[PDB]
Every structure is written in structure tokens, then in C-alpha cells.
Amino acid sequence: PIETVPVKLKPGMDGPKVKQWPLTEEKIKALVEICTEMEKEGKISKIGPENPYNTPVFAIKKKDSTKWRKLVDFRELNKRTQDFWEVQLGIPHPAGLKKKKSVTVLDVGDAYFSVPLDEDFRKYTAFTIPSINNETPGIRYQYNVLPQGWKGSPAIFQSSMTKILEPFKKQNPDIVIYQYMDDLYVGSDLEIGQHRTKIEELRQHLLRWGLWMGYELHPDKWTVQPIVLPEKDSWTVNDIQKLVGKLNWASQIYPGIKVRQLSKLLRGTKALTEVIPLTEEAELELAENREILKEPVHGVYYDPSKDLIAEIQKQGQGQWTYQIYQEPFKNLKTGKYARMRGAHTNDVKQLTEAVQKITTESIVIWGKTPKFKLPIQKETWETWWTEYWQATWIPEWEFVNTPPLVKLWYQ
Amino acid sequence: VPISPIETVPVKLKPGMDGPKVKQWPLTEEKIKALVEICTEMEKEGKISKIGPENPYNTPVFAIKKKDSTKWRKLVDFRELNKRTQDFWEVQLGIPHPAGLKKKKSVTVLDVGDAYFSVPLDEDFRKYTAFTIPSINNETPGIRYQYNVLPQGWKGSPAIFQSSMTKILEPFKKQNPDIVIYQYMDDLYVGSDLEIGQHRTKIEELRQHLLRWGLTTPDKKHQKEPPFLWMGYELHPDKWTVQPIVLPEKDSWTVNDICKLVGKLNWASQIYPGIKVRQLSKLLRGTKALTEVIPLTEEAELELAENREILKEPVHGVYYDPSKDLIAEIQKQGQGQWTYQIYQEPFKNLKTGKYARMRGAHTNDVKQLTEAVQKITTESIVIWGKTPKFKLPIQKETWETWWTEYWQATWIPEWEFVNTPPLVKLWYQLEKEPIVGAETFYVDGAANRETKLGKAGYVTNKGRQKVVPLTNTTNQKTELQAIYLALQDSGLEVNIVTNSQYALGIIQAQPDKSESELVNQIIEQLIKKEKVYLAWVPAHKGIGGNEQVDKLVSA
DNA sequence: GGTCGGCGCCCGAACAGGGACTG
DNA sequence: CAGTCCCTGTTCGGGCGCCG
Ligand SMILES: C[C@H](Cn1cnc2c(N)ncnc21)OCP(=O)(O)N[C@H](CC(=O)O)C(=O)O
Ligand SMILES: [Mn+2]
Ligand SMILES: [Mn+2]
């Protein structure tokens, strides 16, 4: 008996037409059960080939979670509805969420099934279930309610969400609550004990309105990865050659980097392994360059209208560095991960973990997901990444092939 | 016209486009008799109806003889209607493979006669399926019909039939969950672990359940005894194989004859191990005419004769036992070619295959092995829904050195080393630290965009020097040429310092094959060395001899 | 005597995006 | 400075194979 919010695609665009990729046996059996149950509850209904639209579908398990979770790759549909969830029903991003001692994430995607979807828009939510060895043709469905993973679901449900959280926000006015996709971010400066208790207060407060899992974050302990120069007492020709090449690359970010006095030490055609004593003017040029790298870059600030971009570098030995920026060399944040799941054995699992951590940080800090530049071959990534995905959202990505230059971001 | 028991699928035309209006082709008198004989039989059965002048549309029509039968097949040239019909989403996601079938107690295969002619078409869309059957006389106006069912030649018919067929089988499959029904169009592979007595009943029940909707299962196409002919294979109780393959024996080969040969070779590669089409595919490059005669090279005749000798011996595949592991083993055939066998018991292949794609201008065996593993993985997930365990001709230590030091992310699933030459290995290793006691070559190269002239050379710490003039070259080619010079003129250990990102990026990927002969010569020199240390320095910064050698190669 | 859909392979042409040099 | 071009990688069009 609920009225539907009319939704339109971006003018001049059509719906998504993305082929379904192969799924493993465990994922298909998980999808068949979920879709059969969702069909019995009227959340989805079968359709036919007269619907030219289609969106890929697979399944995941969250961290330390046994239950399978249906996940739709609505990335292409979210691009073709961008003016809806940013112009009309935009959700504000609290700048204080990143400043809280503890932030917890709550999967509230189950609440979207309560609200029906606009009848004219259901044609674009179509998805197909494959079968092992193509025993049967594809089993096509479409959504009758607000789908999970679609950027229009939290916008339509925002009005209902604000009225559900009003009793809790009043009693706890110092707690920040941010909603992004199927997740709910709850941040507070409370002690770890009573913080999780306030989370359970919100869990029971949400259960009485027809709705569980929690992941803890600590944005106050997030540290950046600066550019560091080696501290050696005996330098060689090769050491100084690598030092100048690194400082030359870093000069594109810090305009005050000078390499003249250090280059003068490399005047002759010397052997790489020859020890070179640093002159007086070179030592001062190195000490001054170290101080500039301590300074923040001039004229760097987040722009709400520009897209976020994230680059990741493989440093070996489980080390992974990353930088987030909107304009080149104007990095809004840099960092480094180490000893993640799959270290010293699985690069794709480590890279998948890195993309998730970086995306989670970008949601807390700016409320946006960055477009990733992945140091991996396209076929290597598209073959394994779903085996390790553990998040209800999916960021956009492209594949790069940049051979290592002068190891700028890691010693 | 009576209402068909099957729910119709609503179909619209694309917005702003009308139906087709095409004139009929001149048909042979032998094909006209077959059409009128079929048209009058379908009109009696309510599948087509007459139309007058109120239908302003028309579409050509023809016929093709059925395989191993005297019956005919009515086809429509709906090429103009498909352009203006709405887009569909195909529900056929792939082709079933017999290596995915599991052993069942009883197996039954049955076809559906005139499958498209038993599924209704949308009422509002029948007007656009108008055609004219020419009579034996050119002056006779001819009979005009319109389709009441799914035509043959319309882009919506296959997607509609497969979706319609799946909906009819759902109530039967729901009542009989332990009965496997492979549904490829109208071909039904039915197998079960029930006793053969109860199996014949369930088949008759299915033949009655399909009959309640207009789907006829003729006893002619019924198959109760092995070997079953299914999807172009021969299914036996313990094994399977492809139906006999005939390769053309042309004395004078054309371009189209090679395409027909290459296709059947790829088709045979699914069970016949060791098929190579590298040299034969080298005949299709740079050619323009399909009917152009092309002579066979010495490498193509040897490859063709080897494929024929493989097809002489009978090969067969087995079925999938879900209780035992899935194993895939890869071998390095020729340069750029790979074959694999997927099995569970030794020498009992489920299927075979080959990978031979050339990705990029610079590659190595380790990259191509990773590409073959990924191709087999995706193929296995389609067929079996799981990734097989790999046996690879690469040392565990070799692969460890590669993926840990590579700048890209790369990974191979659970695998074990199999000692079967030729083994995949890295042919040279760049040092991580500069070499003490090794000569240090500062290399550089430059060229002019207009004159296409340039210089390549080096300057070392021992005063050694060289500059070579280069004609018809580029900046990138000279900088590779400078590294090649320092490799020729150095000892077994060398330190090379360049400012070429392009040159350093190629070499650090440790290639062993390249489309550039210059890179191949660099590779050949790198394998002769014992310790090579490359290093990059920025240009135009007055660094070492890199500035001195930059001014030497300026012109 | 030339229809449709699906999947696979092989090829070349068209498309595209980064790096070093030049007016 | 933007303009090329030298190089490399990707996507897509079109032929065959095979199935219904
Ligand atoms: C019509 C469907 C699919 N289908 C098969 N061939 C087709 C073709 N050339 N064009 C378009 N659709 C085609 O198949 C039903 P069918 O009547 O059971 N099978 C025979 C095939 C034979 O036995 O040779 C036939 O249709 O001729
Ligand atoms: Mn049939
Ligand atoms: Mn140069």
C-alpha cells in the first residue's frame, strides 16, 4: 500500500546491457536458493527475453560470515541514473565521521525490500542466473522492490531512514550516522565497551522497524605514507643516482625540490659501486629536501564536484602503497598496507583487500568511491576478484601497466 | 484461430520504424512444391493464416533440405525485420559439453518436431510476419500468409523458444527433482539414477507433459539405446567422443578451405590432444579474397600431416565424477602454442584443448603460461563450476621468483610442478644491486623526426666509448640500440645506466620472445651474461656520463 | 539455392592512451 | 606551451567450425 517514487534514467541514455559472467557451483546454488526465496516473498519475479536489459549477479561472504549474500553489479545502472541520487535526493556527508575514535558499519540492505519500486523502472533491474555446463538457459528475474547495491535505494529510503533514526539521534546527539549504499556508518567518541553497546541499542532499535553484522573502524589511527629519503652515512654513485631520480620525480609534487648540488657529484663517468663523499653544498641540499617532504603540498584540497582516483603500487613482501587524488600530483591522501590476507602467496587477494580498504576509507572521509588504477592485467583480475570480494559495493576500476620507476612511495 | 496453451511473449518494434516491404526472390520449381506442401499443411494446423491486401508488408522466403531426410525446412529472410525489431537478451549463455555430464543409470534423448511451429507468436506482431508464396506460374498472384507461431529467421524466435521451453519444463522438473534434463533448444537429454522400470514411465510422463502444450516427441527421434547422438557427440555408458570429423583433401587450397579446415581442427582439439593450427593460421594473415588460391608452406604441410595422423587414432573422453578432484595439465608445444588435458584419473581425459594467443609485442613463457591457466580456469567454471588443480611444467622456485618480483599483480591457483620438458623458466635475471668490479656503461640514443637519422652509443668508467650512426630509426629504437651496444662490448658482468623509460620497461619484464628483432638480439645477449644491472637516471640533469653520452648522440 | 541465436578460434583494421620531442 | 608520432594495447567486424 506504499506509493512509489518515480525514477528516470539520465536523459539521453539507455539501460544496462552487461553479459553475465560464469559463476562457480557454490555461488549458483546460493543464488538459486536466495532467488527462490526472494520470489516467494514477492521481492523478485521471473521475466522473459523481451527485456533487453541485464546486469551481472554473483554472491559473496562478508568477513567471518558463513551466510552467502546476493550481490548485483549495478555499476553500469548507477552510472545511468547519476542525476537522481545527487541532484534531487542527495545525502549529506558529515565531515565529523572521519574524526571519531570508532566507526562501525552495519549492513542495512535488508530494509530496502520493504519499499516497492517504480513499475516503469523495474525493466532495468533485470539479471540472469547461469547454470553449470549450460544445462538450462538463463533464468531471468527483475526486482519488484528497492534492490540492494543500487544508488537509488538509499535515496528513496532516506526519508524513511531519517524518521527511524530520529528517536535514536535525539537520545544520542553526539553520535554521527552516515548512510552509503546498503551500509550504515555509526561513529562515536565513546569508550570501546559502551560504543558497541550503543550499536546494539541501534540494532534493537532497527529490529522493531522491520530489519545486523558489524565491522569496527578507527579513523583516528589512520596514518599517511610520506615520501622518505634514505639515511646513509656512506653513499655510492648508484645511491646518489637513485636519490636524484627519486627527488626529480618528487619535484612534481613539491616544487621546492632541488637536485643541482647532488647532480654535481655525478659529473664524471664513475663506477656505480664507487663511494662518493657528499660535499658541503650537497649535504645542505639533502637536509633541506628532507624538510620539504615533511611539509604539506601547497594548494591541495578536496573538490566535491570532481571524481576521486586511486592508484596502487605493488612493493613486494606484502607491501602495498596507494595514493588518492583528483588532480595529478595533488594527492588528498597517501598510505601503505602490509600483512593483509594472502600476503606472500596471493597477489589478487591482497589487491582485492587493498581496494576494499581504500574504498572504505574514501567513503568515511568524502562519501565517494574512487576509480581505481589497478596494477594488474585485465584477464588476471576479471578471473579471480569475485573469489575474494567481501563488500556490498563495487568501485570502478581500470587496468594500468607502469613498470617501476624510482620506487617513489616505498623505501 | 484457437488460443495456444503457451503464454505469448509481447514483442514490439523499435520506436519510429515500420514493418518490412521486400519483394520475393525467384524460387526454383522444386522448392516451390515443398513450400506449398508445407504451407497448406500448417494452415490446416492453424500455424499460418491467409491475409488479403490489408497487410502492406512482405518478406522473402526460401527452403533448405533437412539433414538425412526427405523433409524440407521453411526459412524466412527476416533480415529487414530484425533490423527494426526490438532488442532481446539471449538466454542461451553457452554450449553444454559432455565432459560435464555425470554418470546416470538411464539416459533418454528426444527431439521435438517442428519446435518453432508449436510456440505462439504475439497477436499484435503477426501482421509484420507477412510473406508471399510464388505459384508455378509467374502470372498467378500467389498466396499470402502470415505467421501465427515463431518463424525461422527472426531474431526473437530462439530467445522466445528457449524461455518458453524452460517455463513448460519447470512444473515437471519441480515434481521430479532427481531427473536431470539438459535443455538445449528443443533437444532434451534426460537422465536419472532411478531404476530402468520407473525411468521409462517418467519419460512417458514427460512426453505427455510436453504434449499438453503442443510439443510432440516423435518416436522416430526417440533414443533409448546407447550410443546416444547428442550435440554432435557419441555418448556411451562409460565414455564419449565427437562424431566423425572429415577434413578436406584439396590439392589446391583456397582461403575459404583453410578457414573450413582451421575450424574443424579447433573443433577436434576438445578431445584430440596435440592439435596445432599455428602454421595453418599463418596462411590467413594479410589476405583479402576468400576464393584466392594460396600454396601450403613447408611448415603448414608438416603441421597438417601431424594433425591427420592424430585424427587416425580413436580418442574418447570420460564423464565427470564429482567425488574426485579435477586436474588440468599443460604442455609447451611450439613457440607460442600450448595444449592442456583436463582429467580426473590418469590418461582418462574429460576433455583437451589448446591455447595459442600472442598478447603483446614482448612476452615470455611465464606470462603465456599464466594466460593459459586463466583460460582453462574460466572454461572449467563454465563446464564444472570449479577450478581444477594444475600440473605445470614450471619449477616452484621459478614461479616464486617471477610473481614476487613482478610489478604487476599475478597469481596461479593451487598447482604442482610436473617434470615434463620443455620446462618453463626465466632465461636471465637482472641484479637488484650494482655489481662490484663490473664495467659501468652510460648509454643513450637520439634521432631526428624528419631526417630519420640518429646515433646510439655509450661511455664507460674505463674510458671505453662508441657511437654508431643509424639510418631510418626513431628515438625509441636508438635507445634500445644503445643498450644493445653496451651488451655486445661488455664482459660477462656489466652495469648499464640508461634514461629510457621505454627501453627499461621492456627489459625488466624479462622477455624471451619479441616481435622486434632488435629486442630479440638484446634478449640473446642478456642470456649470455652472468650479472646484468640496469638502472634509470633522469635525462638532461647532468648526471654521470649520461650527459656526456647525450651530447655525443645529440645529432 | 545465402535466415536466426548461442559459444569457440583466427585475422586486420579501427580505436586509444601514454611518453618524448618540438613550434 | 599544444602539436605530432612512435609505440603498445584494446575493442570490434567478419570468416569458419559446432549445435538446435
Ligand atoms: C527451428 C529450431 C532451431 N533451428 C535449427 N536449424 C535452424 C535454422 N537453419 N534456422 C533457424 N533456426 C533453426 O529447431 C527446431 P527442429 O525443426 O526440431 N530442427 C531442424 C534441424 C535439422 O534437423 O536439420 C530444423 O529446424 O530444420
Ligand atoms: Mn526438433
Ligand atoms: Mn636519449
| Ligand 2 mean position, distance from CA B7 (Å) | 20
Taking contacts as CB-CB distances below 8 angstroms, the residues of chain B near A380 are 370, 374, 408-411
Q: How far apart are CA B127 and CA B143, in angstroms?
A: 15
Cell, residue A86: 545527487
Q: Which residue is nearest to nucleotide D4 (CA to C1')?
A: B449
A83 annotated as a binding-site residue: no
Residues with Cβ within 8 Å of residue B70, at least 6 apart in sequence: none
| Ligand 1 mean position, distance from CA A253 (Å) | 66
Contact between B131 and B61 under an 8 Å Cβ cutoff? The reply is yes
Q: How far is CA B442 from the centre of its chain?
A: 47
Dihedral of CA atoms A97, A98, A101, A106 in degrees, nearest 10, equals 60
Nearest CA of chain B to the CA of A134: how many Å? 5
Q: How far apart are CA A189 and CA B447, in angstroms?
A: 64
Q: How far apart are CA B383 and CA B102, in angstroms?
A: 12
Amino acid at B477: K
Dihedral of CA atoms A281, A287, A291, A297 in degrees, nearest 10, equals 60
Q: Which residue of A has its CA nearest to B97?
A: A133
Count of other CB atoms within 10 angstroms of residue B87? 14
Q: Is the CB of B268 under 6 A from ligand 1?
A: no
Q: Count of H helices and E strands in chain A? A: 10, 14
Q: What is the resolution of this structure in A?
A: 2.7
Q: How far apart are CA B425 and CA B396, in angstroms?
A: 10
Q: How far apart are CA B86 and CA A53, in angstroms?
A: 12
Q: How far apart are CA A349 and CA A341, in angstroms?
A: 7
Q: How far apart are CA B460 and CA A269, in angstroms?
A: 6
Any idea how long chain B is? 555
Contact between A151 and B198 under an 8 Å Cβ cutoff? The reply is no
Q: Which of B430, B522, B509 is nearest to B482 (CA)?
A: B522
- Angle between helix axes B517-528 and B501-508 (nearest 10 degrees) is 60
Question: Cell 544496462 appears where?
Answer: A16
Amino acid at B322: P
User: β-strands A183-188, A102-107: how paired?
Assistant: antiparallel
Q: How was this structure determined?
A: X-ray
Nearest CA of chain A to the CA of B412: how many Å? 8
Q: Is the CB of B185 under 6 A from ligand 1?
A: yes
CA B527 to C1' D2, in angstroms, rounded, equals 43
Q: Is the CB of B462 under 6 A from ligand 1?
A: no
Give the nucleotide with minimal C1' distance to the Cα of B267. Answer: D17
Taking contacts as CB-CB distances below 8 angstroms, the residues of chain A near B170 are none
Residues with Cβ within 8 Å of residue A377, at least 6 apart in sequence: A399, A401, B408, B410
Question: Cell 533487453 appears where?
Answer: A52
Contact between A138 and B97 under an 8 Å Cβ cutoff? The reply is no
Tell me how far CA of residue A381 lies from CA of A65, B122, B416, in angstroms: 24, 43, 22
Q: How far apart are CA B237 and CA B242, in angstroms?
A: 15
How many residue pairs from chains A and B have C-beta atoms closer than 8 A?
Answer: 206
Shortest-distance ligand to the CA of residue B481: 3
Tell me how far CA of residue B302 lies from CA of A227, A285, B252, B277, B309, in angstroms: 59, 68, 16, 11, 11
CB contact under 8 Å between A241 and B409, yes or no, is no
Q: Is the CB of B540 under 6 A from ligand 1?
A: no
Give the nucleotide with minimal C1' distance to the Cα of B445. Answer: C20
CA B227 to C1' D16, in angstroms, rounded, equals 29
Contact between A75 and A369 under an 8 Å Cβ cutoff? The reply is no
Q: Give the nearest partner residue to B385 out of A25, A54, A313, using CB atoms.
A: A25
Whether nucleic acid strand C comes within 7 Å of the CB of B262, the answer is yes
Tell me how far CA of residue A268 lies from CA of A86, A99, A156, B437, B457, in angstroms: 60, 53, 69, 18, 17
Question: At residue B263, what are phi and psi to the nearest 5 degrees?
Answer: -60, -45
Continuous segment of H or E residues that includes residue B465 = strand B465-471
Cell, residue B286: 594479410
Any idea how long chain A is? 411
Cell, residue A127: 539479471
Tell me how far CA of residue B546 lies from CA of B433, B461, B468, in angstroms: 19, 11, 16
Amino acid at A194: Q
Taking contacts as CB-CB distances below 8 angstroms, the residues of chain B near A140 are 89, 91, 163
CA A229 to C1' C17, in angstroms, rounded, equals 32
Which nucleotides in chain C lie less than 7 Å from some protein C-beta? 1-12, 19-22
Q: Which of A131, A44, A38 is nearest to B169 (CA)?
A: A131
Question: At residue B58, what are phi and psi to the nearest 5 degrees?
Answer: -160, 150
